A paper describes a structure:
Many functions of Pseudomonas aeruginosa type IVa pili, including twitching motility and surface sensing, depend on dynamic cycles of filament assembly and disassembly powered by the cytoplasmic ATPases PilB, PilT, and PilU. Addition of pilin subunits from their reservoir in the cytoplasmic membrane to the growing filament is powered by the extension ATPase PilB via the platform protein PilC, while extraction of subunits from assembled filaments back into the membrane during retraction requires the ATPase PilT. P. aeruginosa encodes a second retraction ATPase, PilU, whose function is not clearly defined. Single-cell imaging using iSCAT microscopy confirmed that pilU mutants grown in liquid retract their pili in a PilT-dependent manner, suggesting that while not essential for filament disassembly, PilU may be needed to generate additional force when pili are tethered to a surface and thus under higher loads.
To uncover the unique role of P. aeruginosa PilU, we first determined its crystal structure. The structure was determined at 4.5 Å resolution, with four protomers in the asymmetric unit. While the overall domain organization and distinctive C3 symmetric hexameric architecture were clearly resolved, individual side chains could not be confidently modeled and were therefore not included. Based on our previous definitions of packing unit interfaces formed by adjacent protomers, the PilU C3 hexamer has alternating open (O) and closed (C) subunits, mirroring the C3-symmetric OCOCOC conformation of Geobacter metallireducens PilT. The OCOCOC conformation of PilU has been identified in PilT structures, while the assembly ATPase PilB adopts a C2-symmetric CCOCCO conformation. PilB has two N-terminal domains (N1D and N2D) that interact with regulatory ligands, while PilT and PilU have only a single N-terminal domain. Sequence comparisons between PilU and species-matched PilT homologs revealed a striking divergence within the final 60 residues of the C-terminus. While the first 30 of these C-terminal PilU residues remain structurally conserved, the last 30—typically absent in PilT—are predicted to be disordered by ESpritz and were unresolved in the crystal structure. Structural predictions suggest that these residues extend outward rather than integrating into the hexameric core, and recent Alphafold modeling studies suggested that this segment of PilU may stabilize its interaction with PilT. Our X-ray crystal structure of PilU showed a typical PilT-like hexameric ATPase architecture, captured in a C3 OCOCOC configuration. These data support the conclusion that it is a motor protein that assists PilT in pilus retraction under high loads, a hypothesis supported by recent studies showing that while pilU mutants can retract their pili, they generate reduced retraction forces compared to wild-type cells.
Numbering used by the authors:
A (entry chain D), C (entry chain D): 3 to 352
B (entry chain A): 2 to 351
Write the structure that this text describes.
Amino acid sequence: FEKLLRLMVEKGGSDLFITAGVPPSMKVNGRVMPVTKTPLSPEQTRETVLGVMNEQQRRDFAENHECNFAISARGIGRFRVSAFYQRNLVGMVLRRIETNIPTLEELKLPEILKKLALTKRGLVIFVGATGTGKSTSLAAMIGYRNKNSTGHIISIEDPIEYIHQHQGCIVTQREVGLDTDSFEVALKNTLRQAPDVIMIGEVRSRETMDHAVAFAETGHLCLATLHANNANQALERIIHFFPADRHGQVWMDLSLNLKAIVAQQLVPTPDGKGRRAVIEVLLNTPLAADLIRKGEVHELKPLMKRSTEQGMQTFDQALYQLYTQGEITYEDALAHADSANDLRLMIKLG
Amino acid sequence: EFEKLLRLMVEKGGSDLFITAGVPPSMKVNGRVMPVTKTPLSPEQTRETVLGVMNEQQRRDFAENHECNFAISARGIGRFRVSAFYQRNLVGMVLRRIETNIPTLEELKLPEILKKLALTKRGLVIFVGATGTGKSTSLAAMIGYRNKNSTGHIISIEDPIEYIHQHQGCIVTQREVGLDTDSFEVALKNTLRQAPDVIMIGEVRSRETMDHAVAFAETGHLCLATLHANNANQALERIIHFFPADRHGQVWMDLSLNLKAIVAQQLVPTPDGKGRRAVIEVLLNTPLAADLIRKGEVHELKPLMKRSTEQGMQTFDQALYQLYTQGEITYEDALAHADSANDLRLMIKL
Amino acid sequence: FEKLLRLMVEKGGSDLFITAGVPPSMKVNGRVMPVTKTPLSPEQTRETVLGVMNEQQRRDFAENHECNFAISARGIGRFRVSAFYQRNLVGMVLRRIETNIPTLEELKLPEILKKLALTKRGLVIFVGATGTGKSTSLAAMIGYRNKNSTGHIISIEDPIEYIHQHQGCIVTQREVGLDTDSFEVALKNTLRQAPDVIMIGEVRSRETMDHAVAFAETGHLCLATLHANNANQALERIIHFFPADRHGQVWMDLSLNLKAIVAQQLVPTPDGKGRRAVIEVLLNTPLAADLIRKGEVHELKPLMKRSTEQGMQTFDQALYQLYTQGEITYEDALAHADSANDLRLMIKLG
């Protein structure tokens, strides 16, 4: 089993497949390819899947017919497993935890992210739908701060998607369910670990939101991801974490400590061989803070269209900057625009 | 060995010591993480060093909960608080040095109005300021003044405890959240039944903490607390936002009735660049100030503080004016730190 | 240990202090004074604090780091204890349960309370902030009915603040957590114990409110305390105990059985050596009952200003009656008034 893991790391496989009826196959560059010539038997698949679990994980797997966990192989790396029943037979899919962190330039992200990465204190939020590259761009941005500054970075992820090696800053990566019992317990102790930047993998409850706000008030850089399309809907979801009586405080605290909200979309390139990351940037200018303090989240979209000199940009302005660069077609810009008539008016204007 | 690393931190004045795998033993001296040795720590050495500080029971809680926060006492060196944690399935710990020497108000060169406030019998005193402006340092110095100049019981609820005051004229009960109490709210709820004469809340972060502080002052006890806000006006704005708008009318009335003073603190560098001086903005609850508080006219506070310097009040511009005339700050540092660079330039020229 | 309790009762100490680092000290007349000459060791403090708990209280104290309970010493009296961890060391504060009940005249309460104390059936509610003397004035009023009538008084408190000796009425004092499992269980059995007056220590839930309403319908005198500033806000909190569909019944039941709502404030005397109890009285006149039946709680404040002949009085009318008596200054009246302009108009009018 340990030999199959080294082959995946040496060959750069994205995912390993262990199920009955097919040989051990790995997805290398998106192509499922068999590793051996002999398919796995139901007994060998049941012996291989259960052999990776401990006594408690074997109990949860037999009761719930499913079990998702993570493992750490000494000297090889880490990988996330998704075990499952299939046709009343055991099966598991393993995903290698990547370590080669792309840079902000390799992702072709705007330069305002670099200034945000070197910020000393504040709250930065990565919004976007599922799989829009939020964690990918965040880890790329995390590598920028790790390489360009000195300090301590504390990470709480569920799961850890990228493992950053110790560069200029000390990097402590903790995964929920292995290194900590929950997000709340880790963030509660993150303050006493003398961090300089704290990255919450995802804010899913009000307790996670309170810790993120308290992190920024103490002069630390707080980063987190949340599932929302743009900056306006992200603020709407955050305020709904709290009862209405605490909204007045939430609007005031958000207007005081927030630094930026980065919304990310993935639009296909003209050649169809890849996807480009569209970034909507909202910087906390004094006018934006007043709109936040008043809860006038509706007034945010017009304000971002007039302050492009400070570093802000909507999705229509970012798509306008990418279509003029030739990185996206004309049809892809109008289909991905927040307003297909404004983007058509923005492109026709110059 | 380990005891030698503690003496080096005390002799070099390190704020925090870092013990984790992948990086050499590093200490945060003056906010800069610096390695102590040249050889990084191995996972076995980090696991042997972290577990070596725990007893048999702390090693059991650490293995079950993946986290363990505790405190230790080294004979002849001092005390330090540790925050152990799992990180990438590896052990790690951060140690924070606890300070036992409590300075005096004269050593901090604080205004004499603080001494009269320290000996007050009942009321609410609030320390405002940005992160690291010496709020807790000046408060502990003020706490040592009341502890040495009066008889009674002082109850302290901190997160964490930054200074440990020995029993002087008053009985000093220091309780830290997470070790001596489960939360700020639980400790303040029981603080009333412990017969205190002065109660110091480490920081007010919610409305429940604010309600207890108000109830503490109504019962004839001296209540002190810290909050993160630049000046007195913004501190009042943040406090009222803790509550829904329907309860604002009561909050303005209660604040106008029990409040004693609001002390805003700024740190300006001395002319020689070798240190920083604490600038103190003092707002005393005169009858005119109480009426402005009862009406919610927080905007009318800044002009009122400029005309009542005889009673003990002073703005940041008046305090910076008193320090620049003393030679404790340059002319450029006064205009850059002034709330109004034109008023301070007019105050100095007058 | 039993000798230290007798010394506190013989010397009239308000609170006894048992913590490491200081001798056993008692707060007599507000002055913390040491009893012995030798301070207590951590082992002696740990042996004294844990020695008062049973096996279960020692388990809750070790797990939660805090434990509040009550004890009964045969032949001495009762005292409430608040144990706590402090600097990872045990400590406890003991408060003596007072038995010398002040009378209504000693508290200088209005005579309408005497007529309310001798009432046969109905609901009387003591409102006020934390520590406004609600339980103190109630126990004083309880001693009036106990001494001036014959019957059975049933008390459910959490905790019992005053212990009334058997006078004209039979006095059964039950404390939650020692004499009963909960407020609901005690009130459920209070009906089958043939009472004539039932005092609920505090109404904190709807189940407690339902029992109080049912107590008054059965021809018994029901008294209870709740935390609210005045009569209007007390009614708002009571109706919010119930869903909106049951509000129509609650308004009708309140208009039918309620007798009075007594709001209490504590204003300092001119000499600054004490505090005087300000009492806002709202009597259930037919016009008030109609405003209650319609839910027009807003219409209550104007009605109380016009029916001073029946025994009602607002906070502004009571403060007007105390300022004319010389028991409060002119500045203390305008600062504590519900309307500083109406009280200024009430005082200027005569």
